Amino acid sequence: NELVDTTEMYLRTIYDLEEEGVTPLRARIAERLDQSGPTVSQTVSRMERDGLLRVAGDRHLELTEKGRALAIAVMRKHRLAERLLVDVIGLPWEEVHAEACRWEHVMSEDVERRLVKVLNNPTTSPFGNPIPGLVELGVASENLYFQ
Template identity: 45%
Template sequence: MSREHATVAEEEYLQTIYWLEEAGLPVTGANIARAMQVAPPTVHEMVGRLERDGYVRRRPDKTIEFTERGREQAATIVRRHRLIERFLTDVFDIPWDQVHEEAERLEHWMSPIVEERMLRAIGDAKTCPHGHPIFEGEREEAVPLADCEVGAKIRVVRFENEAEDLLHYLKDAGFYPGLEGKVADKSDDWVAVESSEGHRLEITRSVAETVSVKADPSPPPRTALPEQLVMAREHWGR
């Protein structure tokens, strides 16, 4: 029997599943566990609950997909999360690397009236401060910065992993969505970008895996997706 409304815990899982799917990552119990930093048995129990409540179904290959009801619920909570982030940054002037966890606390309690007022307040903004689309279906294609060749012109589109201490690291390094420049140098351990203002910005290669950019020339498409998108924080190699 399905519930009329998802619980807060269910919404958090639906949001994670939506993000994994949006990023093109396999929606498996292992990836959900890594993304949420919880034990696999906990994920197994919650996915069973989501299935019973009519939000997801398991495919024969054990991957997880949304039902129509589940996708609608997930898209709503993701939209609210990204809208809150944009509102806090643009209206309350909170730095973009400090709004993710605030939005997680607020997203479950937003009424339709508050959502409507926030949408008016942000004007024509289409993305959250980290570059993710507020509205479903508007995600800009991009490639990992780590894949770009030295000399490639780049524009930062978004930060795929929004864990707040990683966002602090990127901001401290001088990165932000919209940053333009070129790949100045790279090694097995780090990637350096020369910004259009002439500043050298350097981050570890593992973090560069989570920075999506438009690049010219664009690197060839990957056959495997970067594990860093769902890795626990202690594994970022910083």
């Protein structure tokens, strides 16, 4: 299975769409994961059954609290993996996302906590984007900065 974990990739794709300011719709998942329209619909309904998302009136997709927690954790592993691959392993930049897209599905939280120490409390991926879920991971808390 090229996606490694299909469910986690539907979750991470919906999260991507949210960071991008794009409406999370099935058609976007089909495009980005190279799956047919009906396959996406069936996977999505199975995830709804599983309590990972809701399919709204207008057909837009919404992560549930359960689905959102899991999406965050995958994206956290993804960006920690990219940090590792660039900062420590020295994998060229143009190859790190593809690699991280596999590793995000197999990294334990224990490794993530080690990576947070080894990488010196990283807060962003190599590509500038914030790493989510660090509070839930147990390594950080959030302060407010007033502008």
